[PDB]
Amino acid sequence: FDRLQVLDDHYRDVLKEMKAKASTVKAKLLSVEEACKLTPPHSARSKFGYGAKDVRNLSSKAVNHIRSVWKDLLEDTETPIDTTIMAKNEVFCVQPEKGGRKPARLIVFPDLGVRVCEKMALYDVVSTLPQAVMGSSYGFQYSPGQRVEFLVNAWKAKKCPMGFAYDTRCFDSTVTENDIRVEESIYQCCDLAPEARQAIRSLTERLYIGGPLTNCGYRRCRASGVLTTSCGNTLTCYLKAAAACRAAKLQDCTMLVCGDDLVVICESAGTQEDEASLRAFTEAMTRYSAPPGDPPKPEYDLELITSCSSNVSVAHDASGKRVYYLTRDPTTPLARAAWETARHTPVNSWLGNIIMYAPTLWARMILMTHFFSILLAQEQLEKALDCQIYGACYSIEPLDLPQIIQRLHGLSAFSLHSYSPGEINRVASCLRKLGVPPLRVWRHRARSVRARLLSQGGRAATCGKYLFNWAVRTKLKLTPIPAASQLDLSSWFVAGYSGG
Ligand SMILES: COc1ccc2c(c1)[C@@H]1C[C@]1(C(=O)N1[C@@H]3CC[C@H]1CN(C)C3)Cn1c-2c(C2CCCCC2)c2ccc(C(=O)NS(=O)(=O)N(C)C)cc21
Ligand SMILES: CNC(=O)c1c(-c2ccc(F)cc2)oc2cc(NS(C)(=O)=O)c(OC(C)C)cc12
Ligand SMILES: CCCCCCCCO[C@@H]1O[C@H](CO)[C@@H](O)[C@H](O)[C@H]1O
Ligand SMILES: CCCCCCCCO[C@@H]1O[C@H](CO)[C@@H](O)[C@H](O)[C@H]1O
């Protein structure tokens, strides 16, 4: 029966509350220049004789064509807009050389001109509306450290906490026409410029609801930009879930939403009562056309909930105080890093894993040790690497890792010890399974890596001091690494990542 959507009073009530909050948002219509500057340098070429760089640093051909696309969006409210379907080759896969089928992910996008028009009309709404509507439930406002703080405080707030994760399997292609229209109705509640209001209506009717796809066919999958798709999915999932919490009569809910991924922390009503409540929640979500991947399970320990491939775990700082942090099973991070040891990638998953999971036993002992050893050998500590973290691609120098880690995780990230036996066992058994040397070997290797870094001075010695303080018996004190704004001077006089 594919997608069949049934909307009730709970859904309608939550939508009114969302629209009432949306009404307090005043969003601005970006000029051609403002939108052009937001174009990524490696954004796909237009079929109209220009393509990134030209748009990015303003060009007569690019700007005048994008102004005609804009005029057409304001004047035509129904003609379907075309989208291109392309195969982007896979990174962690054996790629045929001198003939063969190339493993690839498929990407669907409108012409570059349309993409800049979408930014003019929606960038300010997508970057302001979700937080204004969902508040603390909006998952993309948090750093790993702030996210864990939010979760733990929500868990501690309950008399008898219960929590569960709910994941909607492949929604990005299966997005209903209704969901797209409901999203638009929320965006329309903002204080928009009249041209924005029309452009939003045209884009939703001509592009977002569906349209033709070419190098052909017709698509009903998301053709919006990353920021637009993210906003849409999060608002839709929040709407359906907040309504489903009411239908399931869940008490004192705290939700955390990241696109299609969600977590609810509420008050337990007893084992069998909670099991019934979750069945109720799932029935409501399924009726709202958001069925689960795996049926949700009530959890009574925060550590047992897995969401966005991660779970909360405990460690202790140097003073013995409990420190909470996000971790994950290290099999895929290690397997991808093994690949990268043999072959250079444009993603540098190892570096992204060190940044996302810096407090973890496996990122500190294995990934930092192994890659600093390689960088020392190759004399490439200074070389900025392109690193993909979630959406974006960042250029990161390994020498700036202490500063980055402190910003995202806090100073405790460098002093953690007394990790949970279960967490250690997951790491240890994983090393045995993959043929990786045990943790005792990594300590020996890190003492040598730290020594070589210290001898190099500057940022290299700060990497030695902060990142490998776990490897020495006689530990250094470790004070916060000061930001350029704290020092009260320009980033030009501050080595590495300063505050830009
Ligand atoms: C499929 O999933 C995985 C996952 C992990 C590993 C492998 C495969 C690779 C099988 C192993 C291997 O033997 N390798 C050698 C060395 C590194 C890795 C990849 N490389 C292309 C060839 C076993 N093996 C893996 C890693 C990873 C390297 C990146 C950072 C994280 C650890 C190792 C790191 C050091 C040794 C280590 O030092 N082993 S040792 O002491 O027995 N010896 C000196 C080689 C062995 C490793
Ligand atoms: C809705 N779920 C969440 O927001 C997340 C949870 C979580 C895990 C267990 C729970 F019990 C509750 C939440 O863990 C995460 C880890 C990351 N990445 S990271 C490791 O880089 O921080 C994340 O960042 C991206 C997607 C923005 C979002 C979440
Ligand atoms: C160590 C475990 C991870 C695998 C590392 C090997 C990476 C495979 O990489 C492959 O190498 C071939 C030979 O140059 C190329 O022909 C392929 O295009 C490439 O995908
Ligand atoms: C795995 C992450 C679980 C998060 C638990 C947050 C609640 C912490 O709770 C604390 O636990 C301590 C345990 O020794 C007790 O001493 C404290 O009294 C209690 O408030």
**C-beta separation of 62 from 50 below 8 A:** yes
Do 258 and 180 lie in one domain? The reply is no
Our count of domains for the chain comes to: 3
φ, ψ for residue 360, nearest 5 deg: -70, 145
**Does ligand 2 come within 6 angstroms of the Cβ of 326?**
yes
User: Is 82 annotated as belonging to a binding site?
Assistant: no
Q: Rounded to an integer, what distance in angstroms lies between the CA atom of residue 429 and that of residue 334?
A: 13
Please tell me the experimental approach by which this structure was elucidated.
Answer: X-ray
**Does ligand 4 come within 6 angstroms of the Cβ of 156?**
yes
Q: Rounded to an integer, what distance in angstroms lies between the CA atom of residue 165 and that of residue 159?
A: 20
Residue 445 CA: distances (Å) to CA of 96, 254, 441: 36, 44, 6
**Does ligand 2 come within 6 angstroms of the Cβ of 356?**
yes
Is 493 within the bounds of a domain?
no
State in Å: Cα 324 to ligand 1 middle: 29
Cβ-count burial of 286 within 10 angstroms (0-12 exposed, 13-18 middle, 19+ buried)? middle
Of 434, 441, 443, 445, best ligand 1 pocket probe by most atoms within 8 Å of the beta carbon? 434
Do 421 and 477 lie in one domain? The reply is yes
Q: Which atom of ligand 4 is nearest to the CA of 420?
A: 1
DSSP labels, 365-382: IIIIHHHHHHHHHHT-SS
**In sequence order, what are the beta bridge partners of 109?**
84
Do 28 and 159 lie in one domain? The reply is no
Q: What CATH number does residue 228 fall under?
A: 3.30.70.270
Give me the residue label for tokens 């959406």.
391
φ, ψ for residue 255, nearest 5 deg: -115, 150
Q: Rounded to an integer, what distance in angstroms lies between the CA atom of residue 166 and that of residue 146?
A: 21
Cβ-count burial of 369 within 10 angstroms (0-12 exposed, 13-18 middle, 19+ buried)? buried
Q: Rounded to an integer, what distance in angstroms lies between the CA atom of residue 470 and that of residue 467?
A: 8
Rg (alpha carbons) of the chain, rounded to whole number: 25
> Listing from the earlier edge strand, what are the strands of the sheet with 83-89?
104-110, 83-89, 211-214, 218-219
Do 240 and 181 lie in one domain? The reply is no
User: Is 167 annotated as belonging to a binding site?
Assistant: yes
Question: Which of 361, 305, 298, 291 has the alpha carbon at shortest distance from 147?
Answer: 305
- DSSP label at residue 102: P
Report the alpha-carbon angle 335-144-477, nearest 5: 95
Q: Rounded to an integer, what distance in angstroms lies between the CA atom of residue 180 and that of residue 265?
A: 28
Nearest CA to ligand 4 atom 12: 322
Range of the domain at 441: 306-482
φ, ψ for residue 153, nearest 5 deg: -65, -35
Do 257 and 149 lie in one domain? The reply is yes
How crowded is the C-beta side of 178, counted as CA atoms within 13 Å?
11
Helix (H) or strand (E) holding 18: helix 9-22
The binding-site residues of ligand 1, defined as CB within 6 angstroms of any ligand atom, are 334-335, 337-338, 341-342, 366-367, 370, 434-437
**Domain final residue pick, 242, 275, 305:** 305
Do 2 and 51 lie in one domain? The reply is yes
Do 92 and 231 lie in one domain? The reply is no
**Does ligand 4 come within 6 angstroms of the Cβ of 302?**
yes
Label residues 59-76 b or e (16+ Cβ within 10 Å = b): eeebbebbeebbebbeee
Which amino acid is residue 412, in one-letter code? S
Q: Between the CA atoms of 270, 272, 274 and 277, what dihedral angle is there, to the nearest 10 degrees?
A: -140
**Does ligand 4 come within 6 angstroms of the Cβ of 303?**
yes
State in Å: Cα 96 to ligand 3 middle: 10
Is 233 within the bounds of a domain?
yes
**C-beta separation of 152 from 274 below 8 A:** no
- What 3 state SS string does 441-461 have? HHHHHHHHHHHHHHHCCHHHH
**Does ligand 3 come within 6 angstroms of the Cβ of 108?**
no
Residue 384 CA: distances (Å) to CA of 89, 103, 122, 275, 482: 23, 28, 32, 50, 21
Structure tokens at 412: 């405790």
DSSP labels, 32-97: HHHHHHTS-TTPPPPTTS--SSTTTT--HHHHHHHHHHHHHHHH-SSSPPPEEEEEEE-SSS---S
Structure tokens at 178: 């209704």
Q: Which atom of ligand 1 is nearest to the CA of 333?
A: 31
Neighbours of 163 (CB within 10 A): 25
By DSSP bridging, strand 218-219 and strand 211-214 are: antiparallel
- DSSP label at residue 30: P
Of 147, 152, 423, best ligand 4 pocket probe by most atoms within 8 Å of the beta carbon? 152
State in Å: Cα 76 to ligand 2 middle: 41
**Domain final residue pick, 305, 333, 348:** 305
Q: Rounded to an integer, what distance in angstroms lies between the CA atom of residue 340 and that of residue 482?
A: 32
Which of left, alpha, beta for 85 (phi over 0: left; psi -120 to 50: alpha)?
A: beta
Question: What would you measure as the largest C-alpha separation in the chain, in angstroms?
Answer: 72
**In sequence order, what are the beta bridge partners of 292?**
168
Which of left, alpha, beta for 433 (phi over 0: left; psi -120 to 50: alpha)?
A: alpha
Q: Rounded to an integer, what distance in angstroms lies between the CA atom of residue 496 and that of residue 399?
A: 8
Do 198 and 154 lie in one domain? The reply is no
Helical residues (DSSP H) of 205-348, grouped into ranges: 226-247, 271-287, 331-342
**Domain final residue pick, 255, 277, 305:** 305
User: Is 13 annotated as belonging to a binding site?
Assistant: no
- DSSP label at residue 205: I
Neighbours of 290 (CB within 10 A): 26
Do 160 and 295 lie in one domain? The reply is yes
Is 21 within the bounds of a domain?
yes
Is 68 within the bounds of a domain?
yes
Do 112 and 249 lie in one domain? The reply is no
Do 73 and 140 lie in one domain? The reply is no
State in Å: Cα 443 to ligand 4 middle: 30
Question: Which of 294, 450, 419 has the alpha carbon at shortest distance from 357?
Answer: 419
Do 74 and 141 lie in one domain? The reply is no
Is 264 within the bounds of a domain?
yes
Q: Rounded to an integer, what distance in angstroms lies between the CA atom of residue 257 and that of residue 231?
A: 11
Is 57 within the bounds of a domain?
yes
Which amino acid is residue 460, in one-letter code? A
Q: Which residues contact 426 (CB under 8 A, 6 or more apart)?
A: 329, 330
Is 399 within the bounds of a domain?
yes
The three-class DSSP label of residue 99 is coil
**In sequence order, what are the beta bridge partners of 106?**
87
Q: Which atom of ligand 3 is nearest to the CA of 341?
A: 1
Please state at what angle helix 421-434 crosses helix 331-342, rounded to 10 degrees: 40
Resolution in A: 2.8
Which long-range contacts does 211-216 make (Cβ < 8 Å, 24+ apart)? 211/80, 211/81, 211/82, 211/83, 212/80, 212/82, 212/83, 213/82, 213/83, 213/84, 213/85, 213/108, 214/82, 214/83, 214/84, 214/85, 215/84, 215/85
State in Å: Cα 110 to ligand 4 middle: 50
Is 497 within the bounds of a domain?
no
